[PDB]
Design a protein around this ligand. Sequence first.
Ligand SMILES: Nc1nc2c(ncn2[C@H]2C[C@H](O)[C@@H](COP(=O)(O)OP(=O)(O)OP(=O)(O)O)O2)c(=O)[nH]1
Ligand SMILES: Nc1nc2c(ncn2[C@H]2C[C@H](O)[C@@H](COP(=O)(O)OP(=O)(O)OP(=O)(O)O)O2)c(=O)[nH]1
Ligand SMILES: Nc1nc2c(ncn2[C@H]2C[C@H](O)[C@@H](COP(=O)(O)OP(=O)(O)OP(=O)(O)O)O2)c(=O)[nH]1
Ligand SMILES: Nc1nc2c(ncn2[C@H]2C[C@H](O)[C@@H](COP(=O)(O)OP(=O)(O)OP(=O)(O)O)O2)c(=O)[nH]1
Ligand SMILES: [Fe+3]
Ligand SMILES: [Fe+3]
Ligand SMILES: [Fe+3]
Ligand SMILES: [Fe+3]
Lengths: 419, 437, 436, 419
Amino acid sequence: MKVINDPIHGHIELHPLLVRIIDTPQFQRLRYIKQLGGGYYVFPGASHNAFEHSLGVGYLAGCLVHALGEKQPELQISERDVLCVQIAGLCHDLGHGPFSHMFDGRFIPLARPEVKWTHEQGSVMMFEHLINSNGIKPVMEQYGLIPEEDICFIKEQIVGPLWPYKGRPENKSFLYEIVSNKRNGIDVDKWDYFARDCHHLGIQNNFDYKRFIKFARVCEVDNELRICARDKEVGNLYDMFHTRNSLHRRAYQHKVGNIIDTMITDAFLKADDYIEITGAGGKKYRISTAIDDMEAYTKLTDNIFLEILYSTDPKLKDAREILKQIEYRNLFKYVGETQPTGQIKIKREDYESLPKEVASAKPKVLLDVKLKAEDFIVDVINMEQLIRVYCKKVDRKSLYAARQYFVQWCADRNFTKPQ
Amino acid sequence: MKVINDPIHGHIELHPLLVRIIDTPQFQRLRYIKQLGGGYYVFPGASHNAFEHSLGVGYLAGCLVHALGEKQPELQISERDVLCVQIAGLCHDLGHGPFSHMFDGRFIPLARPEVKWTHEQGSVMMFEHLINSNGIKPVMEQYGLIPEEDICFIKEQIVGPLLWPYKGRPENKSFLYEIVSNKRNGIDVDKWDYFARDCHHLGIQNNFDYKRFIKFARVCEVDNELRICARDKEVGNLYDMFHTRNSLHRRAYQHKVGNIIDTMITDAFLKADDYIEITGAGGKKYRISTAIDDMEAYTKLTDNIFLEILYSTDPKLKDAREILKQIEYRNLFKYVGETQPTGQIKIKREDYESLPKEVASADVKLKAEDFIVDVINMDYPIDHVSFYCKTAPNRAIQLLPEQLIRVYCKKVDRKSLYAARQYFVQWCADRNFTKPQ
Amino acid sequence: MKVINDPIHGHIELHPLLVRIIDTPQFQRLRYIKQLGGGYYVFPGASHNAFEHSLGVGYLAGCLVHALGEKQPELQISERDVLCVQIAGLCHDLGHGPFSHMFDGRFIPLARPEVKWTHEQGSVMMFEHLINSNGIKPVMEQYGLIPEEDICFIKEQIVGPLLWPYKGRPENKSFLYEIVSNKRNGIDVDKWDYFARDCHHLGIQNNFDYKRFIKFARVCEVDNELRICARDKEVGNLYDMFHTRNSLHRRAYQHKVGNIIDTMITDAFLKADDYIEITGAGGKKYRISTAIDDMEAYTKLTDNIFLEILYSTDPKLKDAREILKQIEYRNLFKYVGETQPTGQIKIKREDYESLPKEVASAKPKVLLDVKLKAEDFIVDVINMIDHVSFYCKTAPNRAIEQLIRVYCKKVDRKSLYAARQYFVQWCADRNFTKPQ
Amino acid sequence: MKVINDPIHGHIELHPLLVRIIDTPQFQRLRYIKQLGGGYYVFPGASHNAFEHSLGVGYLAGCLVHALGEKQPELQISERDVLCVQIAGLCHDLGHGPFSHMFDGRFIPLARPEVKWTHEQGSVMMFEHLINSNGIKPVMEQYGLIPEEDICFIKEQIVGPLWPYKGRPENKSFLYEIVSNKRNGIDVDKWDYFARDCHHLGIQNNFDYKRFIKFARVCEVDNELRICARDKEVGNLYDMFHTRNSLHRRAYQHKVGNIIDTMITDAFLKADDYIEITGAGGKKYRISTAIDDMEAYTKLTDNIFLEILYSTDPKLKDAREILKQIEYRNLFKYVGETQPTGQIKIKREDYESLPKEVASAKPKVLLDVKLKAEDFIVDVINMEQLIRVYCKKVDRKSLYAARQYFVQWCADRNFTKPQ
Ligand SMILES: Nc1nc2c(ncn2[C@H]2C[C@H](O)[C@@H](COP(=O)(O)OP(=O)(O)OP(=O)(O)O)O2)c(=O)[nH]1
Ligand SMILES: Nc1nc2c(ncn2[C@H]2C[C@H](O)[C@@H](COP(=O)(O)OP(=O)(O)OP(=O)(O)O)O2)c(=O)[nH]1
Ligand SMILES: Nc1nc2c(ncn2[C@H]2C[C@H](O)[C@@H](COP(=O)(O)OP(=O)(O)OP(=O)(O)O)O2)c(=O)[nH]1
Ligand SMILES: Nc1nc2c(ncn2[C@H]2C[C@H](O)[C@@H](COP(=O)(O)OP(=O)(O)OP(=O)(O)O)O2)c(=O)[nH]1
Ligand SMILES: [Fe+3]
Ligand SMILES: [Fe+3]
Ligand SMILES: [Fe+3]
Ligand SMILES: [Fe+3]
């Protein structure tokens, strides 16, 4: 029973089966992926990686089921169920790529627009690659798990159904609300990284997650079983929501932070043709096509940033120069922000077209210089949706032009006007 | 005038000249060097890098000199003096290598026992390379610094004198040299930051309040010298600082697994030294062990070198790579025992390479290649701290808390370990070391 | 099991027996007695009363005894021992009168030099009156107390003994008498709370972390006896506590105007003592100064007696009312000087009344332009590391003034000058230090 | 220039003119009026009075106006303006009666439903009484004020117009926004008592009023000059609002605290008839009619609670027993809560009727007991409006009855159903 010190949760005790999963290359992989990606280039305290976060969510996942299990013995929550929820909590973010959400959120859409990719999909794949590669299934049975049934359960908690769930019966419906909760969005994943991002960012956390946990109970709501709170900690709920809004307003939506993630992304796009990651059977993969083979994906982390930066290969100069602009702090320039009214949602696959769309708008009054689409970055921020535009040219005569193309682009697409 | 948010110090304000120094390849480099080295492999929260620590030290150096200047205008502390103290604070750890203290503490001594090397030396070398490569001296003058002897001052604040031995400032401003790196108490803003910072990442309660000390600190005469002295009501705070220091060392820095992993990473670098090429100045190519000789190569040497080995396909690198994979699967070297050299003078860096052979020479037989000998130092003080009362303000005025030598074995079977245990016990006896309990 | 939110201690949980004691006239009385008395007329944040102080002392006493018991079961601390220690913390300041230390420190001495009175005594009389008035003893037994023995124990924790002088507990449990009121070192939970609390209302930084001290406290043997001892790393915390204590005393408790105002209020009470009637037990009627003789009357004696005077229409009370109106217009007595009785026998409470005659009777000559009677003087008498055992956790079970101020009622320049001379001369005649 | 130590604002420097105003019976009165009234009987840390709050507001009022003038000298802000803004902050709550809002919010409505009264009216009446009784007008001129013009100015800041303002021209309209601002309800009164109540109640305060003051600007908005904050301060505003909601939910709307405030009020109503307060010319007044003469009102503070509690007169027995109930903690019992629907308000003039309305409701399924109007307490809590009903009879057969009468009163009056 390894016990781990954590700056947020204090002591974390880990059941030997978890320890067994943790000590594999496919997991240790997470020590090398910053939680806030390029946020670190705005918040120096944000040095933390997915690894310690994943331990925390797995740890809280355990705490929540055992607390429910003790206060409501009728729910018939077993030894087996607890371990499976911890494992879902531990591996929920296994599928992350370099710089977290930058990777599945922007890069893969821009690099391979055909492809439907989510990091959850990856997490289920990585988890399979892990237990197969490290003979975890024998260990699973030693501690009372049924590989055929429980592995399905674990995967379902992560990605959803592949009554649509075959991993557990409908009477244990409340469990699927524990690691990842789609429709109210209150799950142990958020509790952990709210507290953790706050701790590293120096932002105040008003939410007390453990009082939330032992006032937590299972109740019947519309004849399907969900996790509910007793109502005088409604005061606690609003504190969580305020903590959420602050992290978004102060950190996740930060204007420089997001620019930098789009610069790291631009660098990656310029290096994809040239960088090789070795996957299974010696085959070589691109940064963008490593999602196709997990042996390669295991080797794809935040390190790819430095591999570009330190490279001498002349083929990599254009990428290397973009990363060097970040080091010297000559960043892309902020042009403006807009929103999609009314119900139009920009879809990931239309990301690649947008810089052409803006550049092709006819802004007249026309002025001295005309900008190609290569001069524009269009950034799509989702929770609402924000659309921000940055210009790569820093002439103030180009920057003026970029603003005109933009104000009219919003117009031609019926977006809010850039206040 | 940029302002940075810090989880430890809150908002940090930076002079434009500082931002200029910060926004260079030679400084941002520190974003890619872990502060606690292999500690990250025992304390998952210890994810922090040399970068945020250097900002903190720069900030604190600023806070203290500004505090002194405003309450004692007679000391003649200039705006020029403050900037030089901040810049010294900012760049003091520029010279660190992959995994900080691991690099100059164990790797360089084991790879090149020949060599003169401390990271403080490097910081100076790197500091020179930085201001030269990025045209800083014009910007220094632009803000009123005199490059030729202010740069000397900064370097002297970092590494010490290159009598009154300092050329950077006259003896009447001697107390400034106590701010960033103070060796005769070891009480300086560098320690303050990383006590506060390591605790925050490790979950150890820090009982020293550095902000209170800075608010009561004054310059007073002591033995014909000007020193920074503390108000006498801050003595309780000093005892807390020494216990926090003591907790950090017992609980984290001297962690047994933590150090084993430090020696495993080190063993891997050595097996990779012959084969890894780092591109330096003039296109010359360098090794991990020789990158310290040219700063243009050294800028490209960070923690990344770990993952370059870990991910490599080159068969030359299998030996180094297999050790790192061993760290990943958590098959670490096994702990055999601990001893101290007390009574006699302590082990020096230049004989580190010899220690495994010495152990092998004291059922199954083990050669030196399977032994790891690890030497843990605290520094390779309350009576050196001056107080002042408030009645005559420019006057100086049981219950408190080394070298450790540990040996690890690479063979993990139950009888190699037993033999290994006895090779150790006999090596301890033979060299007059304490007997392993 | 009631839980109360507190700005210093967070949530305070209260055992039902305590709640029964709290919810009585004799206890709720403490809501109407300011802790710092006239200090409030100098520190506007200091609005707090003895009631919240008492909850905290009760809460801390509990924390400490609970903490010790769980870490050293060999001490054999019962649930019953904990309740009695808590009840003692709760009722230790039950005996305070109007404006706290003002009442027993200056008013009763000036009014009845005759009489021996301390509020600790009163806390005991009031405590008896409480549990008898509200039928607490049946409730005590319901929760496992033995009233005759445990009430003696609680009383002894408050006022001290009424060889091993305590009847309430055996010497193997001696360390319990150190928690609420600690005789010779003055380190008790009473001080811990009011240091924290006074700091909090006054805006003075408190550097003592009482939560750390309680978490490392152990009972260890010292000189044949069991005493409460601290870990060796908490010596740093102790020095902070002693400084926080000295800062509170020098900045607030000894504040010059604050004290001048306490003596103005006292003067007013003295001028109103003859004419105010407090209805005691059995319709018997009492004065402010004699209400201490009956607890039923004393329950009705709080800070309110100030506004009763101030708001009065009665002409017998005009003399008193005017002094209190002076406080409102801030025409206060003027500070003339301060002195100390260094190496001299110190002034006793029985001699307080005489002192202003003594000062007016000094002949300061150089003779001055005006002569001042004794009624024109106020003379104020203000009274204020070895003691602590430490332990090594390798070896866990064994150890390792008076101020005299004078104020003049005539303001101031010719009165104030004259006053300084009478005073400097009084110091000489009395061998007190020369006024700075 | 007296300097005062304060737990919230630290050191407060006070101009001699202000010191001249404070040192009067009519101001010092506020030392005897609890800020959270009956709240103290639930939150023991809440021992603080109207006096320290008023100093605080006066201090903040000064800091804000001094700030605007030095960052925007075109605004023409004189020292004379600063002193008038300080005096308005200081005397804005001069008009409070026993237990603050309890007096004008509930007691005076129940005792004299016919009548005008608000404490803001009282503050102006008391301020006038203050300066006349203490020869304040000469000191005003000595430090440069024009009494006829400036006394009007101060009064308007407190109570509003008696362009509607006679005290200052519209080009200085922004000054009327500082002490009491009802357009947005964001004024320095609120900053103080938010911070102060947080400090005494032990509720965490997220608003930094200091950062707000040095980003505050005077700017033109829609024809008029109003006070605005930097766009980087929008996060701080949300913090102020969370701090506010936390206080309302956790303290000001506390169920027992509000119950006790109505018990005290009942105690006053039962004592009104027999207690005499001596006003000007020896004329005698009631607690409810002391608001008519400022000499009597000055001597009307929280002391009236203890005057009843300690009384022997048999006329006062019934009142005294209600207070003794508070001492023993035998309180009214909580029956239920409801809201009005429509944008309809219950008005102060109608408070007196509500207990009769509840008792006359025909609730049934008939009951074991019949309840009189005297057995009901109807409490109206304003921010929305909450309506609570308490019963003075504590047996469960009455308490059951009371609940039926209440739910039925809600029905025929179309309030929401009490859950
Ligand atoms: N220059 C620089 N700023 C950093 C760094 N690390 C964290 N920060 C902080 C400081 C800034 O508040 C924020 C980014 O500021 P920027 O310099 O990128 O843009 P900003 O608009 O604040 O300044 P500007 O007017 O464009 O020169 O992140 C760093 O390594 N270098
Ligand atoms: N296996 C593993 N341990 C970790 C990790 N991170 C932090 N730790 C902590 C947990 C323990 O407190 C400490 C010891 O881990 P070890 O694998 O070295 O276990 P240890 O040698 O103490 O016991 P064992 O060899 O299993 O009997 O390091 C991690 O990522 N993987
Ligand atoms: N005047 C006055 N001062 C107060 C009040 N409340 C708290 N304080 C503070 C301000 C001062 O720091 C101290 C009282 O000073 P005083 O005005 O009573 O006498 P002080 O000797 O400071 O000045 P003075 O003799 O008039 O020159 O307590 C108050 O209500 N009125
Ligand atoms: N009995 C009592 N409670 C107090 C006192 N002071 C503060 N409190 C706290 C305890 C509670 O959290 C809150 C109100 O408690 P109450 O006993 O008066 O009503 P509640 O319905 O919450 O409790 P109950 O149903 O009677 O057990 O105020 C006090 O002086 N006496
Ligand atoms: Fe996650
Ligand atoms: Fe350092
Ligand atoms: Fe006490
Ligand atoms: Fe107010």
